[PDB]
């Protein structure tokens, strides 16, 4: 015996795990079987009390050694077969068939759908940790996959499963293939099918609703724990798991111009980018309706010139405006006498710090558009207040007459004319073609 | 004679860990030092990036192997010293001395106070997983101790620390000694003192208020994760970490008359028992106020007779009442039309031919009320449960009723209640406690 | 007892280091392992990326602190085991047993062979820095050795290894025991054998050949860097690493008559002396066959009188000749017209400075014999030029009438009669019995 | 008690004024700590005063010395270290603590005083990019605050900062010190204090200077190679190269797993290697345009052109597509099928191992190359008979080549498929231009 059946995805209140376990022992009484749980499942499972059937409780406990919560402790065979609840062994010799498939193939995982209502389908999957995004889609090399959707027995070497960081994190159907796809591993969907339980679990609308609410709750906690802020299907059907109008932003107070996600070797969370685009769009719309001359500035102008979007590691949006136009905007003139929360939840405020305005996504989510007011004195756009940035600099007004439409972050914003020049004056030649982080620093990148 | 300094207790927003680490590096530039954190601390700690100083991130990650979060894999030496933030090495050799004490003494752990505003004090500590309770007190054999309260450098063998199930769970001061005391290990509180940092962390009242709040949240999550519902102290102070009026009870629906906690070799969570005793005292009060004749029944009577309280694995309270006084109680009158939530949050229902009073709308810990009526001097009812002890009984057992301490108050019980309990449960029931369904699980 | 495995001796292009590391991890998953290299090995070593296995790069780097290239900072354990490529921990607890022998014995190093085609041998070793010589032999008190030859696991305290000046210079088999034997330390060769790799490295004849080539290059660079000119073995076999006919001599131009090696508290390099003795022999043979009367002069005669050889810190060879005889010698005849390279590559020249001749070992190697022509005036040998040496004096011709045989540099040379009186006349009384450096006012014995 | 250790590292053994240097500092304070550092014992002898505060630090390994003997911090007991070049002399008393006081009261971690030689220190700007293997020098925008110095200066900094560098005394210190300090974001303040020149300066003849300069340039070239600086520039120009060229091998060995060695070193392609690829691309394009072979930028080269008009900074070759029916118009290509062909300009044209493609190597020794992939139109889809394990090696509609479009690339104008943006996304996926990635992300990520 070289395969250990391991059952992780089931619900204590309604399962067919005893039928599952029995079905395998009917084919081999010596079959190693591990049912894994965080706490002792209740009502009792009453699995057969034989040495090859073991219940693995994986949460830490005051009375148990460190090994007791490590799943590899309970597996002494070369391969592990992850079996979902609802499956049943009916035809004999099917785990051996799966081993021979995995031996002969080039994929580190092999899988056989279970004949449930939701049998496994083959999926493509890329994990971008820099972008906190998991991108799913149809599998162009089926039956060679990056991930599975639905019910399948998945077999792989124990050494591969248990060297992952979160081998049994729930839902397995999500956490396993996120880890295996990131490592460039593939799973081969075999033309073998496991039968379904004769008494399938969760066979009522109410039990299914309970299971799905808990399943979705575990998935949401799993993606947040692992830094997946966004799930997409074919670039759409977007599923968010980050910040929003009602939460704080994902990273909070930046020190040394280097936000926390850079030290995590990632870029700006996509929920944060989404909020910045929406605030930029809203603020631009407000200034255009009020008759405020604005133009993309600093990193926003640079990002618009390079790829027409926010630079993917940047953390705010900066606009220049004519200072004499400020009185035209109600939120702005309100923001010079104190903090203003407008009809749509955006907070307009004048950070007395550097003599500029700041518009935050909401009272709790402090992703902001900074507005830098400019006034001409002897033909140059210049303010008697600056900060320690190379690109906080005076510039001749002719860059602003006329202004130019430039795509930026989903809409068309205004830019200085000859913006390519303009950007080279402020950042240096070749800046559009040579990306950079905001402050190297005594470390990496 | 090699010892790794291991730092776990610090706040990312306000810490003195750079000074801590640099102070040890002053005594030995190659001192092995491990800073452990769940997530990457920000603002950056900006530790010296030298091979002997390492940052151990303990949470799972899509792009790291299982080993990357296992702390023993960062520690190669025989001994480890847990150093709290705010501490510092000044005089040389203090770790070597603590090693010397460990090898000469008999305690598996040695410790040295840090001269902060909360230097470590010695405490006794008794852990009862079966009762979800940890009990602290003053240490009779100090400086031999079960646990510590306050700041100390703790040194032990790495094989000892890392074979624990949760060696670095926060707060370490709570988590560590719960696990070591449960094993019968002692900590010896040595005479050595570590100096405090010169620029101590949490210097403003605002900052320590933040730290203590987040410290309190971590401790509550820790105790819930590891099955401590109650912390008690000599002197009577009680710290609750379980259910209450606004939560669910701690255990789900009971199958086979055998609750989930018994299969975990544990008894009723002490918070659930507290709720039951509170519901018992309230319902009794309402019934006496309304003039309803009640007596303790079933397991409540048994526990009252045996030790004047709820049987420690029991999960409800049972009272008999006279059929005919039901109408005297407003809540009971209403409970027959439908579910009544009275002014104190209790939920009166009828459903069975008995009444049920639940602690609250969310907490379904309940007192069951069993109405009986006399037929021929025999107390009877019209529907029956599949319980040996659910039977008719002579009414003279109610004529009269006797005062009996139960669950903190004086209840009413049948006269000759030991004979009463023997009639329903069988002989010797008081002296021979048994789980509710020994066919499934027996005590 | 905690022990860090430290791997230094391997080749990037062909090794069994992953197998080595893996085999120790199979006995303790948290085994601390340090792989040391001067540059990042490419192709990638692909060690398990786990915190207890670390790669230490011993190169300077602009973005790393001093500590990153100092290997002691990677070793936290009391003990360290140097393990060569091609070895494996197959038996549980071999390092522990090596640790116990170290504490029980008196040797600072303990060693275990590995069952390769060349398991470690026990050797004696004396190091003489002053003579630039390392002398190996059979070990008189085996299993206690000064040095090993072949593959072994070598265990010692980290404090002892990393207090050495060059703990990990390659080849470690040579470098380590030069340093430990010079310090009087012993290495006890235990009766413990580590296994060889299942796939040993260098399975082909081409890579086995390419490894020996880089090894010998590393070995020669090591001994030159450390000042070992000569390695000898019982059996007489000699390995040289200094002068030859085709290179320059080891030391540059001598100022103050005090060569650079003397200031380093060493004597003349053994290759330089060898060249001088072969040049003296050759020149004597030329002058004798030419019928040129010659005699041992200056420091050569003094050395001959003391012990029949060159003074061990001396840097040339001196012979006096009769001036009227130079025309008898073909090489001397051409030398007056210009530089002459003769049948054996020796270079005969008439010196710029003082009316004397000089014979260089070769065109590139300027170790030389100086020929001092004298002529008789009134029974007194004289010349028209004079050095600022006290022993550069006239002398009576009867000292040359006749000459006496005197062994020098492996052959029999002609010397003045009464050479004791001759030497004392030129150097002052007691010179034979009182060795002194050529310029005691700058550097004395 | 003195708080500065004078440290002398830049001098020549055959010709120096280090004895005069040491004596001048001892004349202001006879107890002044003075360290002279060398790899080997300097010969002729320096014959420094045999007092305990004057020490020779030999920084090479030795069979009879402890580890500490070759570490420079072993020789310094003071908080501060003054790096003093040969040719300086202390005549004004107390200058060393004016430098200590200036460094304490300022914000630069280094301060420096010029030495009044013929080459007095000038303030410089310096940007070090390890990823691009480049050191960019220029005029200092915020003088007297600098990133680097050129010329002779006493440089004072804390021992803890100097000796925590990886190569604190690597020669030339004028190069190695500031490459390390500028990489860390440290500044050096050129103070308004002057040190006097040696009364009898070293290297006073042309021949002595010529020997010193040849040795110095050899140490500088070895230093830059060891430290991974392939290119030095002054104001973007005056390029100075220390990498590969036409006569050497390329900088990185044979690539395995599509991931060259420089990626594992957390670096991008060496700039010498990129230069050779741009030269070979321009040459090969020039040859094919002259011979009448239709070509187009392909693969990573087309992708780099569309994004920023150059080779992608971590890419290792250039790929062009050609019409197979045009191969016969190029002499070098028709010879490539029969065997390897070195053309008159040193480029090597070969037909592939298997793969039915052509490879043009920069030179016989330097195997950076332009790969040429020929296709032909089956039913209007361009195809080849064999394929690669890469995602982007597929067929494509022929209309993407009727017409071809100009596109700037690598310093010249090359031909691209029309609508190259859509062409790129079909082969690589949507958004490829706006989202850059590495060749094998599962092994090594950007
Ligand atoms: C995943 O990434 C690959 C990159 O090779 C790309 O070709 C593929 O289309 C991507 N799939 C999704 C669904 O984004
Ligand atoms: C992780 O991989 C190593 C190498 O195969 C293996 O020996 C080890 O047992 C694996 N770990 C677990 C927990 O399975
Ligand atoms: C722990 O149990 C002992 C009896 O063994 C008891 O005396 C002690 O008081 C308990 N500990 C505490 C803190 O109550
Ligand atoms: C647990 O203890 C054993 C025996 O001392 C030891 O071998 C093992 O390494 C320990 N586990 C750790 C340190 O994680
Ligand atoms: C080493 O020196 C000892 C003592 O002088 C001597 O007895 C022995 O022969 C020497 N061994 C070798 C190999 O030269
Ligand atoms: C050198 O030995 C001493 C013991 O005297 C020890 O303290 C020190 O750590 C050692 N140095 C190194 C680099 O191991
Ligand atoms: C160095 O980098 C800065 C910041 O990008 C730039 O402004 C400056 O021009 C650069 N200087 C040189 C000489 O490259
Ligand atoms: C590096 O700096 C620390 C102070 O931060 C100092 O203790 C240490 O000695 C320094 N290292 C060296 C080699 O000078
Ligand atoms: Ba910006
Ligand atoms: Ba009960
Ligand atoms: Ba001589
Ligand atoms: Ba390419
Ligand atoms: Zn966000
Ligand atoms: Zn409770
Ligand atoms: Zn020699
Ligand atoms: Zn190159």
Numbering used by the authors:
A (entry chain C), C (entry chain B): 47 to 491
B (entry chain D): 47 to 397, 400 to 491
D (entry chain A): 46 to 491
From the paper:
FKRP recognizes RboP-(phospho-)core M3 as the RboP acceptor and transfers a RboP from CDP-Rbo to form the tandem RboP structure. Although FKRP exhibits RboP transferase, not NTase activity, our crystal structure clearly shows that FKRP belongs to the NTase superfamily as proposed previously. Our structural and biochemical analyses revealed the acceptor substrate recognition mechanism by dimer FKRP: the phosphate group of RboP is recognized by the catalytic domain of one subunit, and a phosphate group on O-mannose is recognized by the stem domain of another subunit. Indeed, mutations of FKRP, which is involved in synthesis of a tandem RboP structure, cause congenital muscular dystrophy;17–23 more than 15 missense mutations in the FKRP gene were found in LGMD2I (limb-girdle muscular dystrophy type 2I), MDDGB5 [muscular dystrophy-dystroglycanopathy (congenital with or without mental retardation, type B, 5)], and severe muscle-eye-brain disease/Walker-Warburg syndrome (MEB/WWS) patients (OMIM ID of FKRP; 606596).
